[PDB]
Amino acid sequence: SQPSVFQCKKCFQIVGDSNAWVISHREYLSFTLSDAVENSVRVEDTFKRSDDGLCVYSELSCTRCNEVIGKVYNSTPIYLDDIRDMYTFSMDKLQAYQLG
Amino acid sequence: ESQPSVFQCKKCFQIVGDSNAWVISHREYLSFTLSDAVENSVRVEDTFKRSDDGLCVYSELSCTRCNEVIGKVYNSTPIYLDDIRDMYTFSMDKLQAYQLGN
Ligand SMILES: [Zn+2]
Ligand SMILES: [Zn+2]
């Protein structure tokens, strides 16, 4: 119906919204946007590996509370290309507000 | 560009409402006014006070999280300000806007 905005559950800093949505994965309790507020988010230095060894990602932090709230996938197999270099956030670390 | 904004208390970032409940706003008071806000986002203080020009009566609005005074509810007005009355009138100096992307 009506779009949503998304915030860190700790400090409430808005990290982006529905209109940059790409896909979600209830499997991993994640969701993925194509865009996000530059200043409210930080991609960390270290490349790290999915639990199944197959992907590489950098952690995402909220620039206000420094919680790790997501990941940016840098290396993927074919089938996870839609995620790659997108902002992939953890549902448990975020809150949605819908506009009504 | 036809895209909504969302509003938050500058201090804690609690969202208090959005553009879709918009009503009117006033450049000379650096304020804006909404017909709705998030249910538990906001507290009306029980003191009743007067505009600088003696004319209206408002109670202060506080952010239930950060206790900051962020606005007011005009309880009593003349005819012309009947738009404002019993509506959430926010202080632009104390709020923040986030306009969504496309
Ligand atoms: Zn945060
Ligand atoms: Zn606040």
Side-chain angles (χ1 to χ4, degrees):
Chain A
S1 185
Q2 194 70 61
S4 304
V5 134
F6 302 110
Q7 333 163 78
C8 165
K9 266 206 187 172
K10 261 264 175 35
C11 55
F12 311 113
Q13 186 166 64
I14 289 168
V15 304
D17 52 63
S18 281
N19 303 351
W21 182 280
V22 170
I23 193 179
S24 65
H25 299 257
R26 290 135 164 179
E27 274 227 340
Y28 296 89
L29 310 108
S30 95
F31 64 93
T32 298
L33 277 55
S34 38
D35 200 22
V37 184
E38 236 103 48
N39 166 243
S40 68
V41 132
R42 170 201 318 122
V43 174
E44 304 295 349
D45 285 331
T46 318
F47 303 94
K48 304 186 102 145
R49 303 179 65 183
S50 54
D51 285 342
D52 73 341
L54 269 152
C55 312
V56 190
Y57 69 86
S58 303
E59 288 188 332
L60 259 206
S61 301
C62 151
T63 53
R64 181 154 155 124
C65 70
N66 310 299
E67 211 62 354
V68 172
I69 50 162
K71 288 167 165 61
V72 185
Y73 286 89
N74 310 296
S75 290
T76 46
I78 22 276
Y79 54 100
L80 303 165
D81 279 5
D82 15 74
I83 287 304
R84 189 212 298 160
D85 299 321
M86 306 289 122
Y87 296 101
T88 309
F89 294 105
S90 159
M91 273 157 163
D92 302 321
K93 297 294 220 190
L94 293 170
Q95 251 173 40
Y97 165 74
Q98 168 158 54
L99 277 65
Chain B
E1 31 276 1
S2 57
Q3 208 61 243
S5 297
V6 157
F7 302 107
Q8 314 165 100
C9 155
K10 282 222 219 143
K11 207 219 168 132
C12 76
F13 288 175
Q14 181 172 35
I15 286 160
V16 303
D18 57 52
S19 266
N20 294 356
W22 180 279
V23 171
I24 182 55
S25 67
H26 311 255
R27 299 184 139 167
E28 330 83 41
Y29 305 111
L30 304 134
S31 97
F32 68 91
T33 308
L34 263 50
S35 65
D36 208 356
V38 178
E39 262 173 42
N40 289 126
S41 64
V42 120
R43 185 196 320 127
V44 185
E45 313 299 339
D46 28 53
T47 322
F48 288 109
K49 336 205 312 186
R50 274 228 280 188
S51 29
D52 287 341
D53 75 334
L55 258 169
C56 325
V57 168
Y58 71 85
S59 287
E60 285 185 324
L61 276 183
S62 296
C63 155
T64 43
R65 181 156 283 124
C66 87
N67 302 313
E68 201 81 329
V69 173
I70 58 174
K72 27 178 81 90
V73 179
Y74 292 85
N75 318 281
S76 299
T77 45
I79 35 274
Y80 49 100
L81 296 173
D82 274 44
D83 313 289
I84 304 326
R85 182 209 284 167
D86 294 352
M87 308 275 79
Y88 306 93
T89 302
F90 293 110
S91 194
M92 298 156 163
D93 254 40
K94 293 278 182 174
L95 277 284
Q96 231 182 39
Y98 167 75
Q99 200 190 0
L100 289 56
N102 314 129

